[PDB]
Amino acid sequence: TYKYVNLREPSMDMKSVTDRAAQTLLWTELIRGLGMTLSYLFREPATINYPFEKGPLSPRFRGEHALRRY
Amino acid sequence: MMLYIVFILSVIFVMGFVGFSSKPSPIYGGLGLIVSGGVGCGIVLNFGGSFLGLMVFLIYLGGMMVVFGYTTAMATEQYPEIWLSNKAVLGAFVTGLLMEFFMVYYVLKDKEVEVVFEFNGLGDWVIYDTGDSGFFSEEAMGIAALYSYGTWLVIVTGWSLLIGVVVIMEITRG
Amino acid sequence: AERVAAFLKNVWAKEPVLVASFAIAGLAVILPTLSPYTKYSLMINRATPYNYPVPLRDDGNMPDVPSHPQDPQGPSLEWLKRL
Amino acid sequence: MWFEVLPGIAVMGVCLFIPGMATARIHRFSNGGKEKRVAHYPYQWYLMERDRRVSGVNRSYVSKGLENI
Amino acid sequence: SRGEYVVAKLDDLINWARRSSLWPMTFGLACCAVEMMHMAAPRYDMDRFGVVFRASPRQSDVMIVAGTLTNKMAPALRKVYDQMPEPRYVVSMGSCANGGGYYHYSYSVVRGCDRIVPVDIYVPGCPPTAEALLYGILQLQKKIKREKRLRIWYRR
Amino acid sequence: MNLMLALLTNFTLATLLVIIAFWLPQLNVYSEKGSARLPFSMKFFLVAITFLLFDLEIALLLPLPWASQTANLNTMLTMALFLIILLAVSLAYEWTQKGLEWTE
Amino acid sequence: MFMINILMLIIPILLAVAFLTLVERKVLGYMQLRKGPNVVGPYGLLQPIADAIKLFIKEPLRPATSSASMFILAPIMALGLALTMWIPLPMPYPLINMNLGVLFMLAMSSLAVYSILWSGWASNSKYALIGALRAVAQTISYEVTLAIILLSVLLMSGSFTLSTLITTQEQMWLILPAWPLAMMWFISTLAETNRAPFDLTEGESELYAAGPFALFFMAEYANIIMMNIFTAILFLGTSHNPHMPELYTINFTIKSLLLTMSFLWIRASYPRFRYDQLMHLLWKNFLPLTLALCMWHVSLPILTSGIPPQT
Ligand SMILES: CCCCCCCCCCCCCCCCCC(=O)OC[C@H](COP(=O)(O)OCCN)OC(=O)CCCCCCCCCCCCCCCCC
Ligand SMILES: CCCCCCCCCCCCO[C@@H]1O[C@H](CO)[C@@H](O[C@H]2O[C@H](CO)[C@@H](O)[C@H](O)[C@H]2O)[C@H](O)[C@H]1O
Ligand SMILES: CCCCCCCCCCCCO[C@@H]1O[C@H](CO)[C@@H](O[C@H]2O[C@H](CO)[C@@H](O)[C@H](O)[C@H]2O)[C@H](O)[C@H]1O
Ligand SMILES: CCCCCCCCCCCCO[C@@H]1O[C@H](CO)[C@@H](O[C@H]2O[C@H](CO)[C@@H](O)[C@H](O)[C@H]2O)[C@H](O)[C@H]1O
Ligand SMILES: N=C(N)NC(=N)NCCc1ccc(I)c(Cl)c1
Ligand code: SF4
């Protein structure tokens, strides 16, 4: 089963044509892109404070070798 | 003295001209013209021509001379030859400076000189006007009159610029 | 009327930037001739006194020329105060 | 957090604030506590030069009033 | 004396500036480059240390060799090293760059980038974690903190 | 005099920063480690030349704020629009003649 | 007393440029879900100092240039002209009160392209020369719209004096009658300053060092700030109270700061134009509209009876 990613006819009525002209002239989609980067500015960042904080690991982690004893 | 500022600027004006007129590498010749243009604007500024002075900077230096340098970098010189390396350029450059220095020295010593024609050396300020108290720039009034008085000038000037566009597209299509 | 309307819709869909340019340029050429305020720009420009108003020698037959600036003869700027 | 960007902005803002503030106060200091006279046109320059002679100390910003009448 | 004291403080100042503004040129040769990207990514944000994400080779202070250096690539890497203005440091990251790694016995692989350029820090792993690389960069900072260029200059 | 001093200060400081940026202590004691047609499109020439001609037109429009103070507004407005329209015709000519294209 | 005034303009300009590097990095960081500099000094406040010192004690690797004089000339011209652009700015009082201040800024800014051209000649490499010429073509192209847009605005102001823009906007910001021009003016300044999405000098060379690199960078960022200060004056005029000039300076600084931050905001948000595409944005989009709006703004004051005074 499949779907089309980019197979659509734009509406050619006056309302739709005027919608695309306003987008062209008023940069609406670009302003909407500015909105998303603005919301990220006000999100808490994901940075951790290395070396005072460390990334999480699991017991299976493969690091430096060692020889063990009984 | 600052009473001789116009004369001093005109001395540098000539030195810039002897610079590019001796024709070194077109890159350095362009620099000499740029310096002369700026010095020439200062001369016009000190006679009360603020707009005309700034047009030299805006149009002559920021416009024409930019396109000259642009074209030089493309179709003439990409790397300058050492300045004054050629003997002919050095001889011409030295000769013009020697002539200029003699004019300056003699006009300053006698406050007048006869180099072909006779000039006064008292300073350019002596000829200035002594009665200005209008609430506007007279140079600005004159230039603004292009649109009221100069209808004919606008028509032929605008036409020539349009033809310049058409012409240069014909020349360069090849 | 319709074939032109079908023409405008095509350029509005394809070249809205050029349609706006030509529309604005047309209004810049047309509206000055239609505006009722255009006549005032001429009057205001003439009402601005850049140089001294040199007085006239009084020969005894100039009843329309004021003798004093505060006399009632001569051009009035009452129209401008309201504007 | 985002407000930790503010200290850098504040330093930038103070830096841009000084030029305008300095010029304004320097003008008052050098012009008797008033705005520096503007003379874009010959008429304004003529009146400023006349003020310099009228001042009696060769300072165009030193004003004389009815006390000189 | 004060003359020695002034030298000691100036060395601290220049060392502090140089380790506080380490601009790397990353040679992203292979998989080790991916972990280098995760160090610039938000969780570790190397930029917060003063380590800008991607500098040009002529504005760089540290070269990070992040992947396998083949024979075909070796001349190009040395050319970029020679164009770096000094002081310049090299961080070798991952087994491949360290000593050849999985491909040590290959006919086409340089057995360690330290055959081509001097190396300041070796980061072990295949690949080293982003955190391990960050540990290595911080170790390079401490190495720069120990430099005594001016002290040795005035004892010459 | 003030403008001269400002200009002299600005470029003198720029000069000082540039020279010191070139001559700073280095602490090393060892030896340190043409006029042809540049392969550049004629299209880039035409941009510069097109800029020049438009710039000359702009020089003629610059007096417009002062020209609007005239009592001969009828003439002034007609001539302003004429000049700008001719500028637009220039652009239309370059455009329709493929002078603004970057292909080929 | 006037030399004091010059220094109190130059030094804060250079300090503001230094800390704009910090602000740009931190604003970009938080829009990228990270922090940016926060180790070198508290909240990264010493990062600009460390960067400045580092760059100046860096080896000044200049390849044997084809012109020693033009190698030195380019950074001096760039930085010298950048500082000159600030001396007529009314904040609210200019250092130099020019009758034709607007025209002076246009004329000086048109000279800044020589630093690009000269640095191309001095590089002694046809590849860098070709990169210089592409940058020059972009810069002069967008000078056309900036000049025409500026002229259109001044038809509502009445003069070339920069402080008269303050008077013109006493009741209302000029962005309201002229938001179409403000839109194209703003984008033109981005392209003029080679800022993303018009940062094609950086992108194309991807696809100078030490102090001399630092000087070109300082001049670039001084121009960025000055352009946004100009935009605020041109379109977001602050009211001036002659008895409290510092209220003008506070409000006008905030607007300029915000406009400068919007430069960083835009850089974080969009991909880069192709070279031919930013050429078409100018010659086939901005210029037709700017010409039409120039015709409109000549007619409008005449037809409304709203011609401003000359003085
Ligand atoms: C009553 C009489 C009145 C008469 C006058 C009426 C006039 C009003 C109606 C006209 C409106 C004019 C709009 C002016 C803005 C310019 C419009 C424009 O040029 O947009 C088109 C341009 C290219 O469009 P494109 O999609 O590429 O397709 C066209 C080519 N086929 O697309 C672009 O330019 C996109 C911009 C690219 C840059 C992106 C980065 C900027 C995005 C953030 C900008 C934020 C807004 C700026 C605000 C500044 C404030 C100071
Ligand atoms: C309302 C008046 C306002 C004053 C306007 C100011 C003057 C502006 C003059 C611009 C004249 C441009 O004229 C322009 O020429 C070309 C002719 O190839 C036409 O365009 C034509 O060629 C293009 C290819 O370039 C074809 O794709 C298009 O289908 C066809 O229409 C435009 O439709 C027309 O607009
Ligand atoms: C390629 C060529 C392009 C050429 C473009 C030329 C376009 C010219 C369009 C505008 C011309 C007329 O523009 C305007 O018209 C009105 C007519 O109502 C004139 O008349 C108006 O102003 C005058 C003042 O002189 C008043 O006395 C008059 O009462 C008033 O109606 C205006 O003075 C003129 O400014
Ligand atoms: C902004 C004001 C800051 C004031 C700080 C004053 C500090 C003065 C001390 C400067 C110390 C510079 O330190 C020195 O810089 C130069 C940069 O070319 C480096 O480079 C130099 O040495 C290396 C060899 O060691 C040479 O190959 C290289 O060609 C040479 O340039 C040196 O490796 C470094 O030791
Ligand atoms: N683009 C950024 N904001 N980051 C960045 N690479 N900045 C460059 C760093 C820099 C350059 C010159 C000076 I003077 C100073 Cl103080 C700092
Ligand atoms: S060391 Fe490991 S992770 Fe790094 S390039 Fe070699 S194989 Fe890939």
Three-state SS sequence of chain G: CHHHHHHHHHHHHHHHHHHHHHHHHHHHHHHCCCCCCCCCCHHHCCHHHHHHHHHHCCCCCCCCCCCHHHHHHHHHHHHHHHHHCCCCCCCCCCCCCCCCHHHHHHHHHHHCHHHHHHHHHHCCCHHHHHHHHHHHHHHHHHHHHHHHHHHHHHHHHCCCCHHHHHHHCCCCCCCCCCHHHHHHHHHHHHHHCCCCCCCHHHHHHHCCCHHHHHHHHHHHHHHHHHHHHHHHHHHCCCCCCCCCHHHHHHHHHHHHHHHHHHHHHHHCCCCCCCHHHHHHHHHHHHHHHHHHHHHHHHHHHHHHCCCCCCC
The answer to the question of residue F2 being in a domain is: no
Taking each helix axis from N to C end, the angle separating F73-96 and C38-47, rounded to the nearest 10 degrees, works out to 120
**CATH number for the domain that contains residue F22:** 1.20.58.1610
Q: Per the CB < 8 Å rule, is A54 touching E130? A: no
Pocket of ligand 1 (CB under 6 A): A 24-25, 27, 30; C 17, 20, 24, 27; G 180, 182-184, 186-187, 197, 231, 235, 266, 270, 281, 285-286, 289, 296
Q: What is the DSSP letter of B8?
A: H
- N- to C-terminal Cα separation, chain B: 57
Nearest Cα residue to G75 out of G191, G206, G201, G208: G208
CB G306 within 8 A of CB F81: no
How many residues in total does chain D contain?
A: 69
CA D4, G214, B58, G91 dihedral sign is positive
Cα–Cα distance for residue pair G125/G136, rounded to 1 Å: 17
G32, G17 contact by CB (below 8 A): no
E94 C-alpha vs ligand 6 centroid, how far in Å?
6
Confirm or reject: Cβ of C25 under 6 Å from ligand 2.
Answer: yes
Residue of G282, G151, G144, B39 lying closest to F56 (CA atoms) = G144
Q: What's the domain count of chain D?
A: 1
- Chain centroid to CA G217: how far? 13
Q: How many CB atoms sit inside 10 A of residue G14's CB? A: 18
> What does the alpha-carbon distance between residue E41 and residue G34 come to, in Å, rounded to a whole number?
8
User: G24 in ligand 5 pocket by Cβ < 6 Å?
Assistant: yes
Report which residue type is found at G15. Answer: L
Which two three-digit tokens encode residue F57? 């037109």
| C-alpha dihedral sign at C72, C73, C74, C79 | positive
Tell whether ligand 5 has an atom less than 6 A from the beta carbon of residue G52: yes
Chain G, 160 to 189: residues with Cβ < 8 Å from chain A are: 183
Dihedral angle sign, alpha carbons of residues G14, G15, G19, G24 = negative
Does E126 belong to an annotated binding site?
yes
CA of F89, nearest ligand number: 2
For ligand 2, atom 23, the nearest C-alpha belongs to F96
- Closest by CA to B39, choosing from E65, F7, F82, is F7
Nearest CA to ligand 5 atom 6: E52
Nearest to A34 among G30, G35, G265 (CB): G265
Do residues B173 and B84 touch, judged by C-beta distance below 8 A?
Answer: no
For residue G20 the two structure tokens come to 């704009």
Q: Which two tokens stand for residue D40?
A: 């874009």
Asked if E144 and E115 touch (Cβ cutoff 8 Å), the reply is no
Ligand nearest to the CA of E122: 6
Exposed e or buried b per residue across G36-58, where buried means at least 16 C-beta atoms within 10 angstroms of its C-beta: bbbbbbebbbbbbbbbbbbbbbb
The ligand 4 atom at the shortest distance from the C-alpha of residue F28 is 22
Find the helix or strand (DSSP H, E) in which E26 lies.
Answer: strand E24-28
CA angle F37, F39, F40 (to 5 degrees): 100
Q: What separation in Å is there between the alpha carbon of B64 and the centre of ligand 5?
A: 34
Please tell me the distance between residue G209's alpha carbon and the centre of ligand 4 in angstroms. 13
Cα(G161)–Cα(G167) distance, integer angstroms: 10
Token pair 């980067």 is found at: A37
CB B79 within 8 A of CB F35: yes
Experimental technique, in short, is cryo-EM
Closest alpha carbon within chain E to A56: E131
CA G98, G100, G102, G108 torsion-angle sign? negative
Burial class (CB within 10 angstroms; exposed 0-12, middle 13-18, buried 19+) of B90: middle
To 10 degrees, what angle do helices G2-31 and A28-41 make? 90
Of F71, F85, F88, the CB nearest to C42: F71
Set of chain A residues whose Cβ sits within 8 Å of the Cβ of C22? none
Beta bridge partners, E27, equal E65
CB–CB of F97/G184 below 8 Å? no
Task: Report whether C83 contacts C40 (CB < 8 A).
Answer: yes
d(CA E119, CA E113): 8
Nearest residue (by CA) to ligand 2, atom 26, is F96
Q: Residue B30 gets which letter from DSSP? A: H
Q: Is A36 left (phi over 0), alpha (psi -120 to 50) or beta?
A: alpha
Q: In what order do the strands lie in the sheet with E24-28?
A: E24-28, E62-66, E89-93, E121-123
Phi first, then psi: what are they for B112, rounded to 5°?
A: 170, 155
Query: Tokens representing E107?
Result: 């006919």
Cα of C11 to ligand 1 centre, how many Å? 17
> Two tokens at B21?
């007129």
- Is residue E113 part of an annotated ligand binding site? no
Contact at 8 Å (CB) between G72 and G79?
no
A20/C20 touch (CB, cutoff 8 Å), yes or no: no
Cβ–ligand 2 distance for F88 under 6 Å, the answer yes
CA-nearest residue, atom 19 of ligand 2:
F96
Residues of chain E found within 8 Å of residue F29, distances taken between Cβ atoms: 156
Domain over B4-169 is classified CATH 3.40.50.2300? no
Note whether F53 and B164 are within 8 A (CB).
Answer: yes
3-state secondary structure of C2: helix
Q: What is the DSSP letter of B22?
A: T
- CA–CA distance, G175 with G238 (Å, rounded to integer): 12
Measured between beta carbons, the chain B residues lying within 8 angstroms of C51 are 134
- Chain C residues inside the 8 Å CB shell of F100: none
If we measure between CA atoms, which residue out of G181, G166, G169, G141 comes closest to residue G295?
Answer: G181
Tell me the C-alpha distance between G51 and G45, whole Å: 11
**Full DSSP string of chain F:** -HHHHHHHHHHHHHHHHHHHHHS------S-----S--S--HHHHHHHHHHHHHHHHHHHHTTHHHHTT-S-HHHHHHHHHHHHHHHHHHHHHHHHTTTT----
Residue B34 to residue G114, Cβ atoms within 8 A: yes
Number of domains in chain F: 1
Of F5, C9, E86, B51, which is closest to residue G2 (Cα–Cα)?
A: F5
Give the rounded distance of the alpha carbon of G49 from its chain centre: 23
DSSP A6-56: S--PPP-SHHHHHHHHHHHHH-HHHHHHHHHHHHHHTSPP----TTTS---
Q: What is the DSSP letter of E65?
A: E
Tally Cβ neighbours within 10 Å of residue G134: 20
What secondary structure letter does DSSP report for E120?
S
What angle (nearest 5°) sits at the alpha carbon of residue C73, between those of residues C67 and C75? 120
Degrees to nearest 5, angle at CA F24 with F18 and F27: 160
The residue assigned the tokens 């001396």 is G87
For ligand 2, pick from C22, C29, C31 the residue to mutate: most ligand atoms within 8 Å of CB: C22
Cβ atoms within 10 Å of G226's Cβ, excluding its own: 23
Residue of D nearest to G159 (CA): D40
Cα B39 → chain centroid: 7
* Most distant CA pair in chain A, distance: 84
In this structure, is residue F101 part of a structural domain? Answer: no
What is the separation, in whole angstroms, between the first and last Cα of chain D?
68
CA distance E108 to chain A (A): 28
Instruction: Provide the total of helices (H) and of strands (E) in chain E, helices listed first.
Output: 6, 4
Q: Which two tokens stand for residue G147?
A: 């000049």
Report the residue count for chain C: 83
Q: G216 and chain F: CB distance < 8 Å anywhere?
A: no
Q: What is the dihedral of CA B16, B19, B22, B27, to 10 degrees?
A: -110
Q: Which residue has the tokens 């209008």?
A: B134
Interface test with E, best of F22, F24, F27 (most E CBs within 10 A): F27
| Least Cα separation, residue B137 to chain C (angstroms) | 11
Q: G265, exposed or middle or buried, with CB in 10 Å at 0-12, 13-18, 19+? A: middle
E148/F12 Cα distance (integer angstroms): 35
Assigned token pair, C37: 């305020």
Find the residue in D nearest to B136 (Cα): D41
Residue B35 CA to ligand 4 centre (angstroms): 37
**CA pair distance G202, G204, nearest whole angstrom:** 6
Q: What is the distance between the alpha carbons of residues G3 and B174, in angstroms, rounded to a whole number?
A: 57
Residue E32 labelled as part of a binding site: yes
Residue of C nearest to A12 (CA): C13
Q: Do the Cβ atoms of G291 and C25 come closer than 8 Å?
A: yes
Residue F33 maps to a domain:
yes
Owning domain of residue D44: 1-69
Chain G CB contacts of F91 below 8 Å: 283, 287-288, 291
Q: Which of A27, A30, A40 sits opposite G31 (nearest CB)?
A: A40
Cβ(G296)–Cβ(C24) below 8 Å: yes
Query: Considering all CA atoms of chain B, what is the largest pairwise distance in Å, rounded to the nearest integer?
Result: 59
Question: Which of C18, C37, C38 comes nearest G288 by C-beta?
Answer: C18
Contact G249, G92 (CB under 8 A): yes
E28 phi-psi bin (left φ>0, alpha ψ -120 to 50, beta other): beta
G139: left (phi over 0), alpha (psi -120 to 50) or beta: alpha
Q: Which residue range(s) make up the domain with F26?
A: 7-96
Using the beta-carbon criterion (under 8 Å), do F73 and C46 form an inter-chain contact? no
How many whole angstroms separate alpha carbon E149 and alpha carbon E10? 10
Pairing of strands E89-93, E24-28: unpaired
DSSP SS3 for D62: coil
Nearest-by-CA chain D residue for A39:
D2
**Taking the domains of chain B in order of start, what are their residue ranges?**
4-169
Contact list, F53 vs chain B (CB under 8 Å): 161, 164-165, 168
Nearest residue of B to residue F84 by CA position? B158
Shortest-distance Cα residue to atom 2 of ligand 3 = F82
Q: Which two tokens stand for residue E140?
A: 């390079």
Rg (CA), chain A: 26
- Compute the distance from residue E22 Cα to the ligand 5 centre, in Å: 12
Q: How many beta carbons lie within 10 A of that of residue E4, not counting itself? A: 10
Q: Does C41 touch chain F (CB under 8 A)?
A: yes
Tokens coding A62: 């493969």
**What is the helix (H) or strand (E) element at residue E123, kind and residue range?**
strand E121-123
Q: How far is B144 from chain F (nearest CA, A)?
A: 5
Rounded Cα gap, residues G250 and G241, in angstroms: 12
